[PDB]
Amino acid sequence: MSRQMWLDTSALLEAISEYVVRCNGDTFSGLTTGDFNALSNMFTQLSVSSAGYVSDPRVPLQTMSNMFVSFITSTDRCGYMLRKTWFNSDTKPTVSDDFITTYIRPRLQVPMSDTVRQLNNLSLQPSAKPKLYERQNAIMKGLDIPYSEPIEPCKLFRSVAGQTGNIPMMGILATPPAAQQQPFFVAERRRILFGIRSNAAIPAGAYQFVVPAWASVLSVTGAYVYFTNSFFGTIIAGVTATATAADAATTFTVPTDANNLPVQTDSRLSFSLGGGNINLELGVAKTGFCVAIEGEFTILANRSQAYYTLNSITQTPTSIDDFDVSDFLTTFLSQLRACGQYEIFSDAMDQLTNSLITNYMDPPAIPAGLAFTSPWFRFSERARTILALQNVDLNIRKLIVRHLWVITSLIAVFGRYYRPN
Amino acid sequence: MSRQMWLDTSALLEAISEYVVRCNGDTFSGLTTGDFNALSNMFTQLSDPRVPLQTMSNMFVSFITSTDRCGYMLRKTWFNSDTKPTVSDDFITTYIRPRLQVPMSDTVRQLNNLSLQPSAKPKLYERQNAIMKGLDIPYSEPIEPCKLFRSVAGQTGNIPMMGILATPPAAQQQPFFVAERRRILFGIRSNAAIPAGAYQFVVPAWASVLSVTGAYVYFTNSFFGTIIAGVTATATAADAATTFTVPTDANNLPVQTDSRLSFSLGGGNINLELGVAKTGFCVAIEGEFTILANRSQAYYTLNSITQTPTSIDDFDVSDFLTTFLSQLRACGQYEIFSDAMDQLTNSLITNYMDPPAIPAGLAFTSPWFRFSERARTILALQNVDLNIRKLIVRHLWVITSLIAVFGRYYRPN
Amino acid sequence: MSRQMWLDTSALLEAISEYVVRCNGDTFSGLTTGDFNALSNMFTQLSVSSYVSDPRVPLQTMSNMFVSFITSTDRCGYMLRKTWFNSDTKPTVSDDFITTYIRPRLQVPMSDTVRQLNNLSLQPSAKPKLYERQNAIMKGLDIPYSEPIEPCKLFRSVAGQTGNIPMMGILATPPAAQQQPFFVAERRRILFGIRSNAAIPAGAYQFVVPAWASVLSVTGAYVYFTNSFFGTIIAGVTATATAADAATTFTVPTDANNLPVQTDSRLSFSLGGGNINLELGVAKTGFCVAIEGEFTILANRSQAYYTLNSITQTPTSIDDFDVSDFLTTFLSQLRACGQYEIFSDAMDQLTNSLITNYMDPPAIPAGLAFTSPWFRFSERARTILALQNVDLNIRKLIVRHLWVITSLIAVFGRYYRPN
Amino acid sequence: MSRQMWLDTSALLEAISEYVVRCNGDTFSGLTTGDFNALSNMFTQLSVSSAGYVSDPRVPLQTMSNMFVSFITSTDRCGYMLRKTWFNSDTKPTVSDDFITTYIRPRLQVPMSDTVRQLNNLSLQPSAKPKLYERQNAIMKGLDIPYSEPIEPCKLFRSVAGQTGNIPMMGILATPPAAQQQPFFVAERRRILFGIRSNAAIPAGAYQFVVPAWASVLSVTGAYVYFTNSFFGTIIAGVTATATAADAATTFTVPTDANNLPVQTDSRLSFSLGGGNINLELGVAKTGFCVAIEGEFTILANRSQAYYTLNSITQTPTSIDDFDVSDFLTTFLSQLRACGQYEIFSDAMDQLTNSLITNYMDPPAIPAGLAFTSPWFRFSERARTILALQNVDLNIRKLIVRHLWVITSLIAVFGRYYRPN
Amino acid sequence: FSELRNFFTGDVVIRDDPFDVWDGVKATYIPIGVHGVRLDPNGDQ
Amino acid sequence: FVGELPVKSVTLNKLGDRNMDALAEHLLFEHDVVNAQRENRIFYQRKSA
DSSP, rough: OHHHHHHHHOOOOOOHHHHHHHHHHBBBTOOOOHHHHHHHHHHHHOOOSTOOOOOTTTHHHHHHHHHHHHTOOHHHTGGGGSSSSHHHOOOOOOOOOOOTTOOOOOOTTTTHHHHHHHHTTTOSSSSSOOHHHHHHHHHOOOOOTTTOBBOOOOOOOOOOOOOOOTTTHHHHTTTTSSSSSOOOOEEOOOEEEEEEOOSBBBBBEEEEEEOOOOTTTTEEEEEEEEOOOOEETTTOOSOOOOOOTTOOOOEEEEEOOOOOOEESSSSOOEEEESSEEEEESSOOSSSEEEEEEEEEEEOOOOOTTHTTTOOOSSSOOOOOOOOTTTHHHHHHHHHHHHHOOOHHHHHHHHHHHHHHHHTTTTTOOTTTOOOOOOOOOGHHHHHHHHOOOSSHHHHHHHHHHHHHHHHHHHHHGGGGOOOOO | OOHHHHHHHHHHHEEEEEEEEEEEEEEEBOOOHHHHHHHHHHHHHHHHOOEEEEEEEHHHHHHHTTTGGGGGGGGGHHHHHHHHHHOOTHHHHHHOSOOTTTTTTHHEEEEEEESSSSOOOOOOHHHHHHHHHHHEOOOBBBHHHHHOOOOSSSOSSTTTTHHHSSSOOSSSSSOOEEHHHHHHHHEEEEEEEEOOSSSSEOOSGGGEEEEEEEEEEEEOOBSSSSSSSOOOOOOTTTTTOOOOEEEEEEEEESOOOOOOEEETTTTEEEEEEEESBBBBBEEEEEEEEEEEETTHHHHHHHOOOOOSSSSOOOOOOOOOHHHHHHHTTTTTTTTHHHHHHHHHHHHHHHTTEEEEEETTTTTOOOOOOHHHHHHHHHOOOOOOOOHHHHHHHHHHHHHHHHHHHHHHTTTOO | OOHHHHHHHHHHHHHHHHHHHEEEEEOOOTTTHHHHHHHHHHHHHHSSOOOSTTTTHHHHHHHHHHHHHHHHHHHGGGSSSSTTTHHHHOOOOOOHHHHHHOOOOTTTTTTHHHHHHTTOSOOOSSSSSSHHHOOOOOOOOETTTTTTTHHHHHHOOOOSSSSSTTTHHHHTTTTSSOOOEEEESSEEEEEEEEOOOOBOSEEEEEEEETTTTEEEEEEEEEEEEEOOEEEEEOOOOOOOOOOOOOEEEETTTTTTEESSSSSSSSSEEETTTSSSEEESOOOSSEEEEEEEEEEETTTTTTTHHTTSSSSSHHHHHHHHOTTHHHHHHHHHHHHHHOOOOHHOOOOOOOHHHHHHHHSSTSOOOTTOOOOOTOOOOHHHHHHTTTTTSHHHHHHHHHHHHHHHHHHHHHHHGGOOOOO | OOOHHHHHHHHHHHHHHHHHHTTTTOOOSOOOOOHHHHHHHHHHHHSSOOSSSSSHHHHHHHHHHHEEEEHHHHHTTTGGSSGGGGGTTTOOOOOOOHHHHHHSOSSSSSTTHHHHHHHHTSSOOSSSSOHHHHHHHHHTTTTOOOOOOBOOHHHHHHOOOSOSSSSSSHHHHHHOOSSOOOOOOEOSSSEEEEOOSSSOBBOSEEOOOOOOTTTTTTTEEEEEEOOOETTEEOOOOOOOOOOOOOOOOOOEETTTEEEEESSSOOOOOEEEESEEEEEESSSOOOOOEEEEEEEEEETTTTOOOHHTOSSSSOOOOOOOTTTTTHHHHHHHHHHHHHHSSHHHHHHHHHHHHHHHHHHHSSSTTTTTTTOOOOOOOOHHHHHHHTTTTTSOOOHHHHHHHHHHHHHHHHHHHHHHTOOOO | HHHHHHHHHOOOOSSSSOOOOOOOOOOOOOOOOOOOOOOOOOOOO | OOOOOOOOOOOOSSSSSGOOOHHTTTTHHHHHHHHHHHHHHHHHHEEEO
């Protein structure tokens, strides 16, 4: 039912998984560890009740997934959750299907749960690699994400007026320069890069860099800022990494700190790219330079919405990540291939995707020009394509993407135990 | 006793550890955490709690030390079957016995392979099982490709292949497949331009079990932080698309795109097609690497090994011995053990070849805790049938780990 | 109260956090999890003696009172005196916050025992709590034998080379003639070698390991010839080699056998002991040895890093023991309610009064001027350790003491919201 | 009704056939055969009307075919079976038609039927020439086919980037070569062929072969591998089959087996071409060589989906077999001609196949360039045509071929007893 | 004790006031008086 | 009540041998009992549907 009901259940399943990994090889003979007890009780709540005793946890989990696939593949059944209103409301739909009456239903505790959540965003050491749940909440209800949760900046990257790619810029940063070019702002897995490259020298002085939309929400701690000539391992041409023992200290400054931030020092920096533009004061002329900020990157408190709401999207077409769904689908895919359905499933998904796209544009017809260049499980790409439709209003594409993601995520969670035979 | 009987206890000790690290700094006054409670009951199920752990490590060193005591664990038979042996050593009698709950325990273990977020860095136990009984490893667990590496036809090694990648080319050479910690590299270096069209690449053995999710595939010129010569990472907004395909996927996988890709190298071959000629090109796949379902056997069975001699990692053992070693050096017993182990290792190799004799040409280049090496050494004897070498490795490994696990609390006084 | 009493409550607050993380999205209705139970009972140690209903309220009140405390020097004065960092003497202090929240929390002697059993654990925490560091830095206690750390953080300034990241510019500049040996460090590897414009003969070379790397230890490492440092290209070194090249190896004072280079084998060895003895096989024009593996701090040798004994020259380059990574949330809250500025001022104050009580006679030393705010500890520690006026010892103690207070703030302020 | 309801009944009629074959010339006076018992009971299950012993099984079997032809022809009636959803979901349609009511309904015992079915894939000697029912299931539901059922490689074939076809590649293999050409991979009825043709001798050493997408499904047992120069009986030029007792051994290896497989030897082998490639090592240089694998061919486990789903198809146009439907139609056709309807049927079919494709493309209209080069029963060709429409994207094309096939088969089964009079 | 409890806990949702179940309800059709009866006509052409 | 907050709790007292309250009186120290017994009034209670 409720979009909420599905999440509460997805969360439960993710919890079951968690406690399974917690119990692996910790299930000893003479004791009932708390973790196991909890795992046991979670199994108990998964089924109906009229599902009786659980002698072998593999079965109820297996049964549940099987019913889920025969559901998520039949338009006639799972149609209800594909219409616009399912995503934007907590309206209990009038739909009868014994999969939902059995498995989907409010599972989380209120209001205690919501509260524990809020308290976590203020917690010291959040989970480094969080559950789909959190992402689901963000992408759908646009809730907040933990203040200390780290993320790889390159994911956040989106297309801007100037450079239209983070990776593509690579082939160009490696081509020697014709003359002094425009600044560039790129990101890796563990560091941010910005600078100016020229075939001629560049005088000492003050140079302004306009922090890109997508990056204006980044924050870094334990960072080292230095000059470098590589980008993802590929060599950058048209820049100098040279310096004299007694060169003129090169410093930069951000609108959030009144003190200058040093460059090329063994000091660990803390600053945020929010608030404006980085004012960089180059100590000694250089023939093209590249600054590197390498440290722990986090999304500025309370601004994760930009990323997950798909608001940081200005132009079309655009670059876009998958919010990591691929990393979670792995198992379900393996299970699909292992019983020969990877194909029959892949078909039913196009069907699901198409019908979803449909219910978003009035009048009800697959927009022309729509042709996917990838399969349902390569979201990153399909998203790009959805977002590239000139026909439909931008804000509607944005919704479609978000919606598809939630459904996709839901799959990655519920299907894992599929075994029809 | 039984091999299972040891693993069972190993697991119980790795459990003692896990819960100990859990209880650190989470031990308060009027509060009994569930973790501490478990830990406590595990301590009991084994034998202040520091004294006992100690007694146990002691008696263990004492045991694995004398070839007369642990002789049975060194026989080709102890590793081959779950047959309860006839032995009366008041160590095994006191510490080794079944501790896991059957069948439940196993059921969980499998439910785990399908788990969304398995442990990023698993316990020795999981490795022991894969290596010994040939079990499965979680489908979503990640590994660093370079560990998965074994020698193949085309090239001797992985790392060594670096110095050759640093030397300018003489003429359009042969394809190369190499791997780092977080990425896979493949291409064709040349000092003369290479036309654009279609290029068949055959995925090596070791690398045919990998699978990547959330990956960026781009053209680069670095390898382990070293410059690759005879390769150009150049292009322009005009250049035509450079796609690639794998049998597992019917569609084209784009390169040099900000798109996150997830494909699988289980098809056996990558079909790459350049859109613009390049003076040597190197494609890189950087993402999350997992080992395909049911193929993790190859790696842990040493069945992925084809040539001789070959390249071989240590299945991460080195990383677990650290604690034990540091406790050895603080006793002076570092040398004594270093030797006793040199015997333990000989004897085991012995019992694998009929007739019973230390084979021709067996000089060890490194001590017992540099397994990755000593393994290379044993996989190097051509006078002894191949398969038997592999087994000695696997077998030697298991004892090593068991040491890594039981000695830790060693304080011989 | 006593220094231990703050650490205890810190650890508790730090635990409460852990469990809150543990409970996120694992709190279902027809199901009480053992985790939630513990959390619930922990929220009871902060309440004034004893069920809650809304944990936000008490925690909020606690942070709020804390900010109000650490802000006014009159109250938190005693925590600044030279004695509070040593003595476990119940302080002559009457203050609401202290009596309402700080008190002994840990179980003795048990906790102490567990902690030790931990050092000898197979897989300790990769990202330890602040508690562990507090103990190291303050009481000089031990760190787990298997805990990994990035070498570059371990770095300190030494006779030969002044900095670690600074050398980056130098290392990328073609050489004039054969230069001296360099010992740089990255996040995941440690580098050394010699660069020249001319060739270097095949033979035996000696490298002295810096006073800071004489504590490192690696496992699962690949040692090889490379030309990059932090992604930046090193010049005056060749990586090139032929399949026919004579093997190059090296030996450590603690392992009589040779350690191969450019091999697919995974090495294990410590750097403590003495000097590295590199046996270069083929002669080459500039070489760079790279050790990329898992780094550890030798048993009972972590005293250097956390007590500041690895510091010999002035000025030195140092890290912050990571506090920066914990202040994140607290800062974010500070900016939320426009206290960021006021707090900074109050801190500069705190810091000054602190520095003060460490030098007789009682006056701020001359020439002291910070280049960064209270939360860029790496820099402030630099400046404090670079005062020609005071003895090296009193400088260190100040950095450490300043740290503990900083850490405490990072832990207690998190729930701040005045409105 | 339900697609499942049709399959179930087909299987029944297809079973009735089987037993009719069994009872032929085994119907004696005083005997009671388990076979005849089965048959006579099955004769009963047809007609919802009555259940008396059938004195003349011809009558009801006829009435049934007649009723069927009269149904399958009128698009007003059998229309519902041509919808996109009928080939997808098991949703009982709200249709009221005399035929469907009297003859279609669930008939297979559940769950037993499936149990038996799966237990079967593991059986030692499966039927060498499977009922249609099996394909119907693989083509429609994507079910597994028996692990050790044999198959002729060439059927399995599909078009690849390198070479366009299989049979046509023959003529080229005949013409002497200009110069050392690119590798070829062709397949006969009982054997697979690969090699490299050249007018000039090619060195002794290692040679890598990329096994095609269609053949990476194969696996053989009881195989003799040797050097030959014939393809379907036609002579291959630019290859030599010469050799001598002195020649060094010529071995080849596959990824699935860590051991060398000998060539031109009397030993019988078994290996899997699912490894992705063959590694051949010519012991002595040859002026053009061609290796042959002659043995028992089987489709690897959980891979038959590629063949029956049309997923092995990557190019366009493409060479495609017919899943053997042609072989089952024989009877029906000969029965049509008998009463002079071969003509009138072809016209109702063209309306069917047309009206079918229609429903497959939104918006609802015949595509441009639909040039049917062959009649309804030469399926193999009509498929190539459907799959050659550049208008509609690959997926919808494939879906139409499959859907068409199922209908085609459904006829091949029900029509046979047709006699209007 | 904590977990012993967590094992032994379950739900039962119960209406506060018991449903009032009517058994002997007598609902039978009654014909109305005499009346004009229209005989529906047969389907014609 | 459970603190200042009033609640309607299941009367374990009348559930025979499922009287979690009595089962807890088995613990060692009076305080451990009280705590458990009060925890009982928190988890075994009547709440809104």
